[PDB]
């Protein structure tokens, strides 16, 4: 059934599973036309497919050419997502294929179920968690590879950098969701927190700065403050 707070540790057991988030697949800018009407212009997007136990991120870049001449793009985007996830699964060796795929939005259930009919043993599940994966395009290196793409492309990352050498995947996921929630609630402030200290850098092969354990505690506290704050600035509390 659905994934929620009660069965949360299931994410970090040894059954392979992927989260799929489609919120950045179809992206547009809305603008005025010379005649004063409104039109959209698509920009490159991405499917965010994440193994929460290992941090492995399969970032399928969606180039704007896939929308050329198509209608009902928001509906097509869900089926395109499901097509690409199905193709990714088929590309993996059998012992790497997931046993479950968790979709962050319930509208992905039928498109993914239909594309995975050949895989009756892979469970397709929704979730009650409100996960902040939409903020993935606030990670500079992910945004850069999406916007520079001139053709469809898959790029592999580890979204935990080297954190699993020092922490568990439960703790790594908690750190990731805190970082992404902060970037989603106040991107400018969050990025200021992450980079204010020029002596801490991002390794070429990493996404996040090379914080020590103690510095991560400070960083993590600064992100919680940001989130609670914004929740005040928003609601006036």
């Amino acid at each position: 059934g659905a994934m929620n707070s009660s069965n949360y540790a299931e994410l970090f057991n040894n059954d392979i599973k992927l989260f799929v988030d489609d919120t950045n697949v179809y992206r547009v800018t809305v603008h005025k036309t010379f005649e004063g009407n409104v039109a959209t212009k698509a920009i490159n997007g991405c499917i965010f497919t994440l193994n929460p136990k290992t941090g492995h991120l399969f970032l399928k870049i969606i180039h704007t050419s896939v929308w050329a001449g198509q209608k009902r793009l928001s509906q097509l985007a869900k089926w395109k997502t499901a097509e690409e996830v199905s193709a990714l699964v088929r590309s993996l060796p059998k012992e790497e294929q997931p046993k479950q795929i968790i979709v962050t939005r319930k509208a992905m259930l039928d498109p993914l179920e239909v594309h995975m009919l050949d895989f009756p043993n892979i469970a397709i599940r929704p979730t009650e968690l409100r996960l902040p994966f939409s903020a993935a395009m606030s990670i500079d290196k992910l945004s850069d590879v999406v916007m520079k793409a001139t053709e469809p492309q898959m790029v592999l990352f580890n979204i935990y950098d080297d954190w699993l050498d020092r922490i568990s995947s439960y703790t790594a996921f908690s750190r990731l969701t805190l970082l992404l929630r902060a970037l989603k609630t106040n991107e400018e402030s969050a990025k200021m927190i992450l980079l204010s200290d020029p002596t801490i850098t991002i390794k070429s092969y990493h996404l996040w700065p090379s914080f020590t354990d103690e510095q991560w505690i400070t960083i993590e506290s600064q992100m919680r403050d940001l989130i609670l704050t914004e929740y005040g600035r928003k609601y006036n509390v």
Binding site: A82, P111, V114
Partner: protein, 300 residues
């Protein structure tokens, strides 16, 4: 005009014959139903006064043999049987008819309701859905499950309706996933009509039989089958024009006949709202939409 004679009526029972019904008291001198129209299938059905649980009954066609009803006190039900001795059967019916011990099939001459509900229903197809090859008539009751229900438990006692499943490899061509799921024309026209049913008459026959088993026996799996067969047509963008016009007439008479008080359990809100107001065929069922809106505007 044919007759279904009865040995006796030892237990109080409500007896249905097609859309008609009458109450028989315990040990009442009731010996049959006469003046049954030739040319249609018929259903004779039962609900005991003491256990309204289990409506049950028999589909039959008097052109196929001489059938009589007799109460079995061991199995506790009214059973249909076939008499092979024709002279004997004619003689039994003639005796009951002279003593005026039978009720008359009470067809009004203007009234085409039963024809309209059974237009495409054939006894040979009923007997493939309800498998009991040693009899020419077919038993159905409230509890019998369908082949599809059993996949999701006795096979001999099942309703072998054609399995319809919109999220199945049969319904979805590799590479046309979105296309075939959002427009079921392939599944309707190639897989089901050309492939399985062979023609629309056989499709409509199974649809009509499923409705009638839902209405007369409260058979839940038959109700599921009826709605699935409607939804498959309404969710197809490409349907022969004659099929849509005929479907409108079929459903009109089914909705007209449905007991007003069973609409809550025999009509699926989602299917009907989708079919009448969202589907490809939302503008193609004028008669059905008008009777639904005037008779059951709450469901919608």
């Amino acid at each position: 005009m044919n007759t279904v004679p009865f040995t006796s009526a030892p237990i109080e029972v409500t007896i249905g014959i097609d859309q008609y019904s009458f109450n028989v008291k315990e040990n009442q001198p009731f010996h049959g139903i006469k003046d049954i129209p030739i040319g249609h299938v018929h259903v004779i059905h039962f609900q005991h006064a003491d256990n309204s649980s289990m409506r049950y009954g028999y589909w039959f066609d008097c052109r196929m043999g001489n059938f009589y009803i007799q109460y079995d006190p061991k199995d506790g039900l009214y059973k249909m049987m076939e008499e092979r001795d024709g002279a004997k059967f004619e003689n039994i019916v003639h005796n009951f008819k002279e003593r005026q011990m039978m009720v008359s099939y009470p067809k009004i001459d203007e009234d085409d309701t039963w024809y309209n509900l059974t237009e495409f229903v054939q006894m040979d197809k009923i007997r493939k859905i309800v498998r009991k090859d040693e009899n020419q008539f077919s038993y159905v009751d409230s509890s019998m499950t369908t082949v599809q229900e059993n996949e999701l438990s006795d096979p001999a006692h099942s309703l072998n309706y054609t399995v319809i499943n919109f999220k199945s490899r049969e319904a979805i061509r590799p590479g046309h996933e979105m296309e075939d799921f959002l427009d079921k024309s392939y599944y309707l026209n190639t897989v089901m009509l050309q492939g399985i049913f062979k023609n629309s008459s056989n499709y409509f026959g199974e649809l009509q039989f499923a409705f009638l088993n839902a209405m007369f026996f409260g058979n839940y799996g038959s109700s599921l089958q009826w709605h699935a067969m409607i939804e498959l047509i309404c969710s197809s963008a490409t349907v022969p024009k004659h099929m849509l016009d005929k479907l409108d007439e079929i459903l009109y008479y089914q909705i007209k006949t449905l007991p007003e008080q069973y609409s809550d359990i025999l009509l699926n809100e989602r299917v009907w709202n989708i079919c009448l107001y969202s589907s490809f065929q939302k503008n193609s069922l004028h008669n059905t939409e008008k009777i639904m809106e005037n008779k059951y505007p709450e469901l919608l």
